[PDB]
Design a protein around this motif. Structure first.
Motif, PDB file in Angstrom:
ATOM      1  N   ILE B   5       0.854  -1.182   0.000  1.00 49.63           N
ATOM      2  CA  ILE B   5       0.000   0.000   0.000  1.00 49.63           C
ATOM      3  C   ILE B   5       0.889   1.232   0.000  1.00 49.63           C
ATOM      4  CG2 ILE B   5      -1.886   1.189   1.164  1.00 49.63           C
ATOM      5  CD1 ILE B   5      -2.423  -1.793   0.339  1.00 49.63           C
ATOM      6  N   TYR B   6       0.513   2.248  -0.766  1.00 50.37           N
ATOM      7  CA  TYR B   6       1.288   3.479  -0.828  1.00 50.37           C
ATOM      8  C   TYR B   6       0.399   4.663  -0.475  1.00 50.37           C
ATOM      9  CZ  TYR B   6       3.906   7.418  -2.628  1.00 50.37           C
ATOM     10  OH  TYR B   6       4.553   8.630  -2.759  1.00 50.37           O
ATOM     11  N   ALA B   7       0.798   5.427   0.534  1.00 45.84           N
ATOM     12  CA  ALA B   7       0.078   6.629   0.931  1.00 45.84           C
ATOM     13  C   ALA B   7       1.066   7.778   1.062  1.00 45.84           C
ATOM     14  CB  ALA B   7      -0.678   6.417   2.245  1.00 45.84           C
ATOM     15  N   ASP B   8       0.801   8.860   0.358  1.00 40.02           N
ATOM     16  CA  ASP B   8       1.663  10.023   0.384  1.00 40.02           C
ATOM     17  C   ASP B   8       0.886  11.208   0.927  1.00 40.02           C
ATOM     18  OD1 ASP B   8      -0.067  10.752  -1.583  1.00 40.02           O
ATOM     19  OD2 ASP B   8       1.380  10.692  -3.229  1.00 40.02           O
ATOM     20  N   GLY B   9       1.632  12.224   1.322  1.00 37.88           N
ATOM     21  CA  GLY B   9       1.035  13.420   1.868  1.00 37.88           C
ATOM     22  C   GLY B   9       2.118  14.363   2.332  1.00 37.88           C
ATOM     23  N   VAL B  10       1.673  15.496   2.853  1.00 39.17           N
ATOM     24  CA  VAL B  10       2.616  16.428   3.439  1.00 39.17           C
ATOM     25  C   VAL B  10       2.957  16.009   4.847  1.00 39.17           C
ATOM     26  CG1 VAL B  10       3.048  18.804   4.014  1.00 39.17           C
ATOM     27  CG2 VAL B  10       1.730  18.246   1.975  1.00 39.17           C
ATOM     28  N   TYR B  11       1.993  15.451   5.555  1.00 38.17           N
ATOM     29  CA  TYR B  11       2.165  15.017   6.935  1.00 38.17           C
ATOM     30  C   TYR B  11       2.706  16.129   7.811  1.00 38.17           C
ATOM     31  CZ  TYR B  11       1.144  10.564   4.949  1.00 38.17           C
ATOM     32  OH  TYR B  11       0.536   9.539   4.293  1.00 38.17           O
ATOM     33  N   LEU B  22      -3.301   6.544   8.512  1.00 36.72           N
ATOM     34  CA  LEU B  22      -2.265   5.552   8.270  1.00 36.72           C
ATOM     35  C   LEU B  22      -2.681   4.183   8.805  1.00 36.72           C
ATOM     36  CD1 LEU B  22       0.791   7.777   9.195  1.00 36.72           C
ATOM     37  CD2 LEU B  22       0.132   7.076   6.944  1.00 36.72           C
ATOM     38  N   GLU B  23      -3.294   4.146   9.983  1.00 38.77           N
ATOM     39  CA  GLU B  23      -3.846   2.892  10.473  1.00 38.77           C
ATOM     40  C   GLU B  23      -4.770   2.273   9.451  1.00 38.77           C
ATOM     41  OE1 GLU B  23      -6.319   3.110  13.960  1.00 38.77           O
ATOM     42  OE2 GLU B  23      -5.894   1.004  14.385  1.00 38.77           O
ATOM     43  N   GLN B  24      -5.616   3.094   8.836  1.00 35.64           N
ATOM     44  CA  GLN B  24      -6.621   2.573   7.925  1.00 35.64           C
ATOM     45  C   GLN B  24      -5.972   1.918   6.716  1.00 35.64           C
ATOM     46  OE1 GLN B  24      -9.728   5.352   7.160  1.00 35.64           O
ATOM     47  NE2 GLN B  24     -10.647   4.097   5.549  1.00 35.64           N
ATOM     48  N   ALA B  25      -5.118   2.663   6.015  1.00 38.27           N
ATOM     49  CA  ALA B  25      -4.397   2.089   4.890  1.00 38.27           C
ATOM     50  C   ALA B  25      -3.686   0.813   5.313  1.00 38.27           C
ATOM     51  CB  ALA B  25      -3.409   3.110   4.333  1.00 38.27           C
ATOM     52  N   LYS B  26      -2.995   0.857   6.453  1.00 39.07           N
ATOM     53  CA  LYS B  26      -2.223  -0.302   6.882  1.00 39.07           C
ATOM     54  C   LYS B  26      -3.102  -1.544   6.991  1.00 39.07           C
ATOM     55  CE  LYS B  26       0.826  -2.973   8.779  1.00 39.07           C
ATOM     56  NZ  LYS B  26       1.966  -3.499   8.000  1.00 39.07           N
ATOM     57  N   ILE B  65       5.610   6.057  13.987  1.00 36.44           N
ATOM     58  CA  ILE B  65       4.224   5.609  13.902  1.00 36.44           C
ATOM     59  C   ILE B  65       4.191   4.106  13.681  1.00 36.44           C
ATOM     60  CG2 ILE B  65       2.104   5.742  12.602  1.00 36.44           C
ATOM     61  CD1 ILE B  65       3.019   8.201  14.469  1.00 36.44           C
ATOM     62  N   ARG B  66       3.386   3.427  14.494  1.00 29.73           N
ATOM     63  CA  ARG B  66       3.259   1.976  14.441  1.00 29.73           C
ATOM     64  C   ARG B  66       2.979   1.476  13.024  1.00 29.73           C
ATOM     65  NH1 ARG B  66       2.436  -1.050  18.452  1.00 29.73           N
ATOM     66  NH2 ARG B  66       1.539   0.506  19.872  1.00 29.73           N
ATOM     67  N   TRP B  67       2.090   2.139  12.295  1.00 27.60           N
ATOM     68  CA  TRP B  67       1.605   1.540  11.059  1.00 27.60           C
ATOM     69  C   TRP B  67       2.551   1.680   9.892  1.00 27.60           C
ATOM     70  CZ3 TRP B  67      -1.919  -0.613  13.694  1.00 27.60           C
ATOM     71  CH2 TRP B  67      -2.539   0.118  14.708  1.00 27.60           C
ATOM     72  N   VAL B  92      -2.774   2.378  -4.065  1.00 23.92           N
ATOM     73  CA  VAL B  92      -2.515   3.718  -3.553  1.00 23.92           C
ATOM     74  C   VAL B  92      -3.678   4.061  -2.628  1.00 23.92           C
ATOM     75  CG1 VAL B  92      -2.148   6.115  -4.141  1.00 23.92           C
ATOM     76  CG2 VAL B  92      -1.171   4.403  -5.586  1.00 23.92           C
ATOM     77  N   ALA B  93      -3.373   4.528  -1.415  1.00 31.72           N
ATOM     78  CA  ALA B  93      -4.384   4.821  -0.402  1.00 31.72           C
ATOM     79  C   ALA B  93      -4.399   6.315  -0.118  1.00 31.72           C
ATOM     80  CB  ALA B  93      -4.138   4.039   0.895  1.00 31.72           C
TER      81      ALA B  93
END
Lengths: 132, 132
Positions: B5-11, B22-26, B65-67, B92-93
């Motif tokens: 799974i790939y999740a991008d952002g500014v964070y 992030l938990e959700q995507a994970k 972060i755990r996930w 992609v999430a």
């Protein structure tokens, strides 16, 4: 081979400094269980000072930190010998008195803070963009 | 059985809303590797808007972060088909256009935001204690 580490705090508005601290306690030994105690609202306000987030808010955040194995929320304000036996705690991890009895027993492991990485300090930064 | 799974952002200024995301995507599947892409300073400022923390600051936080299994920092701003093949990315999430090509390919998994849990919103709270 597994070692139970206990670290408590307010953990209000968690930042990189809290996380490096939790990382540190967690890696005190090859095989650890990190238990984190999250102080209660009334006791924090009463002994320390203002708290920004509720017990629930501060506790739900810790749950996402990699290093955190178990949470005690709320946790007692002062650590007692019974608390240790009750939870089978091997070492209490905290920054560096009220911890002398723990150092006498070989049960105190110090951890260090990291200045700078604080939320507060970031509002400042947001504000320089509008310096008079 | 394992799914990338790939999740991008500014964070930027990470908060409970980022972490639930992030938990959700994970947990999109039983066996996943979560890769997170952290957008670059100049591209964020240029396309989005002001960023408070540097790439380094935003990236060192994710690491706790755990996930989060792997980080790509910096990550490209726009996801391309090559990027996916290069990293063997299965889904992609992201929250829900620029993701249509991904939905056409079965490769887009939506995640939801959580209003309220924002740092900004907490400065507010700190401020009510001094309401005029």
């Amino acid at each position: 081979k597994n070692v139970v580490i206990y670290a408590d705090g307010v953990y209000d508005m968690l930042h990189l400094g809290h996380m490096k601290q939790l990382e540190q306690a967690k890696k005190l030994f090859e095989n650890t269980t990190l238990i984190v105690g999250v102080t209660s609202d009334n006791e924090t306000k009463l002994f320390k000072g203002q708290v920004v987030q509720t017990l629930e808010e501060r506790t739900e955040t810790l749950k996402h930190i990699r290093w955190v194995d178990e949470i005690i929320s709320p946790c007692p304000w002062v650590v007692t010998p019974e608390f240790l036996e009750k939870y089978k705690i091997d070492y209490v991890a905290h920054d560096d008195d009220i911890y002398a009895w723990l150092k006498r027993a070989g049960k105190f492991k110090a951890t260090q803070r990291t200045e700078g990485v604080s939320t507060t300090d970031l509002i400042v930064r947001i504000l320089k963009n509008y310096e008079d």
